[model samples]
Every structure is written in C-alpha cells, then in structure tokens.
Target: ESTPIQQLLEHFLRQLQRKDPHGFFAFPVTDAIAPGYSMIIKHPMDFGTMKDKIVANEYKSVTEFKADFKLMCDNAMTYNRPDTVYYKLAKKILHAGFKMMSKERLLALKRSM
Candidate 1:
C-alpha cells in the first residue's frame, strides 16, 4: 500500500496536468521537491530575476503542500522581486470584497459604458 503522501502527490499531479494540458513531470519519482521534477512545484514554487536559487527538499512530510490552491496561488517569492508584468502575487480574485473592489468596479464601469 502506498503512503498518503504518494496518493496526494498523484492527485495533485493529475489536477495540475488538467489545469495545464502542456504540463510535464519527472516520471518514476514521487518526491517532486526539486526543479525538473515536475511542473506542480516549478510553476508557483519560485520566480524573480534569480536563477532558481531556492531549495525545496526541506519540505517536511506532504502536509506542507496540502493547502487550498487559492491561498497557495502566488509568486512564492520575496526578495529578488520579479517583473510584475510576468509575475502575479496571487491568483485572480473574482469576489466583491475590498481586495477585489477595484477590479469589480472597473468591470462594472466597462459594462455600463
């Protein structure tokens, strides 16, 4: 029987593959804690001008990766800030909360115009 980590990894990989039809993965390896391992981490794991200096194996257990994708959606960077033109700090919010007020207002105004 495989560990829960293995199952979760497989599920995430499949979900990711669905989100990105052109995605790729490191076959035969479930520990996707490194680049070239899989797009699952590579896509949101890091960004900025650095040459991918961050590490990932330190991630203890599979619990860390267990999170709501909405909250997990981000540039995953702090220093070495990347060009915002290509990097988004978070996933797009479609709600009408203050955080999304600007976007919502803009869309509403455009529809009225």
Candidate 2:
C-alpha cells in the first residue's frame, strides 16, 4: 500500500525514468529528500574528454590545450573541479552510449567498425 504522496511521487519518478536513455537497466537508491529514491541512466565514460576537447563547460569554445578547460570546475581550476560534488554531477550527464547485438548460440556478435 502507498500513501497519496507516495503515489504522486511514484508517478513523477516513473515519468522521469521513462525519459532516461536506457531506463531498463538503471537503478534508483533511496535518499533523504522525498523519502525515496529515483532512477538514473548510466554513462561510465562521461568523465573523459571528447575528441581533442575536454567536453566540459557546455560551450563550443576551442583551446590550444585541452587542459585549458575543466568539467564542473570551481575557481577557474584547469582540471575537473576537485571541490565540486562529482557523484551527482556525473549522474546529471548519465547516458547509455553503447549497444550490443548477439550472434550464434553462446557466441557474441562481431564488433562493428
């Protein structure tokens, strides 16, 4: 059984999770707020730079050195802002950027080029 507030919250969470890139394999953990948890899609490689750019700052600005920018920086540091809350920040950028296909019985599909 669930209270009215719980029902509303469940509805909202379902809506949120449905918007995720790969909600099927995602998991949610209960926390302080809302007396419950919420789903989060996964993107393990979100920490790495993209191409020759850091992929930080949300801007298309180019740099002679990728080190000139930082992700979630604070006080103009030249790397990932050490003081920032990384866990939730990473969660904010969650994505499922890979897919897999199978082949013959017990064998895996060939990696595409």
Candidate 3:
C-alpha cells in the first residue's frame, strides 16, 4: 500500500506532467532522437522514470522528487541549444513546476501530514 507521502508525490507528479504539453519529458532521450546523448548525459532523468520510482516507493521525501524533476529539465537545457524549442520548453516547465511546488504551498500541505 502507498504511504501518505507517496500519495502526495503522485499528486505532485500529475501536476508536473501536465506542464509538459508536448510530452517531451515523458520518456528517456534515445540516441536516435539525441545523438551521443548517453555519452553526454550520464544521469538521465525523465517523467517515466519518476513514475516508476513512485511505484517502487523510491522517493523518501518531496525534496528527492523535486530534485529529479529539476534534473530532467536541466538535462534538456544542457543537451539542447538555448535557441532550440526543447530548451525553451524545458525552461518553461521547470519554472512552472517549481512555482507549483513552492515552499509556501508545501508548507500548507505539511498541515495534512
């Protein structure tokens, strides 16, 4: 059974996923889509992996979950040029998700914990 924290994470995940309209962060970046991606990004993070982690109860806290989300966006920014759509989208989603999970909002959620 999922714990209270896990349920909270799932809710957050759903909200973050919605920020990515084209679903660019939905899956891992493949060599076909991004040449030499593996060679460049050693620790690739994506929404799908986050989902699996949630299912496996790998996240111990909201901090860890937020870290992974940031990592995913940072990876895109690192791999794609600033002029590219991928980079722009990543930047937008990153800020949107961060705002949604702000300290004030999180503190409010803590009341339920």
Candidate 4:
C-alpha cells in the first residue's frame, strides 16, 4: 500500500490453444473447479453421500488427489448424457446452436432437464 506499485507481465503459450482438445472424458466439461465454492477444498463426505474410502481422504497431495479425481471425472463422464436432453438449453438460449436438434427431441430434453 506504500505507493500502490504494480508490475504486469504478459506472455503467451502457443501450445495452450493450438493443441488443446475440445472437451474431456467424453462428458461435458467446464473450467476446472467452477461448479461450487471450495469444491476442491472440501469433501462430499462432510455433507454426506460419500460412503467409500476413495473420497473420504484429505487429498493433501497432488499425486494422491489427481489420480482419484481423474477416476471421479471419468465416472461422471461415463453416465452423463449431454445431447439426450436440454441439459444445454440454458446456455443454448444465448446462441442459435444445435440447429439440427428435432422439435420433439427438444421438448423431451426440456422435460428431462
């Protein structure tokens, strides 16, 4: 707070966008750790629903947690159906996307969502 001094540096990594894949694990993906606050800091077990040893730990290290988290993401992706419902409608409203989706399919998706 002395003089409100600041330093700004800018750099670009070519590989970040050039080689980045579109999505993840065959399931819908968003920015990491976006859904809930402190999602990475706390466990579901603290609020119940977690009964297994896999999700009960502190996840104190990256190697320990990353492996477990990868599995969790894979499992979530395995059963998540992005196209079969209006799961994306709220976002689709912003853009005229998924034009090929059928009217009946759209209604069905709306109900499912």
lDDT of 3 by residue, 10-92 (tens): 88889888877888889999999899999889899999999999999899888899999999999999999999999999998
Cα lDDT tens digits for candidate 4, 13-77: 11111222432222323335334323332322111121122244443333343344334333333
Candidate 2 clashes between residue pairs 3 or more apart in a chain or in different chains: none
lDDT of 1 by residue, 1-113 (tens): 65444444444434443432322221222345333434444344321111111132332343344332322233222211365421233322112112322446536644774
User: Residue 16: error of model 2 in Å?
Assistant: 0.4
Clash number for each model: 0, 0, 0, 0
- What is the per-residue lDDT of model 2 for residues 29-94, given as tens digits with 9 covering 90 to 100? 223421322222122111122321222323232222112212212111222244644433333423
Ranking of candidates on lDDT, top first: 3, 1, 4, 2
| Stretches > 4 Å off in candidate 3 | none
Q: List the residue pairs that clash in candidate 4.
A: none
Q: How do the predictions measure up, each by TM-score?
A: 0.30, 0.24, 0.91, 0.23
CA shift of 73, model 2, Å:
16
Q: State the C-alpha lDDT per candidate.
A: 0.32, 0.27, 0.90, 0.28
> Where does candidate 2 stray beyond 4 Å?
28-113
Which residue runs of candidate 1 sit more than 4 Å off their true CA positions? 24-62, 67-72, 76-113
- Candidate 3 residue pairs in backbone clash: none
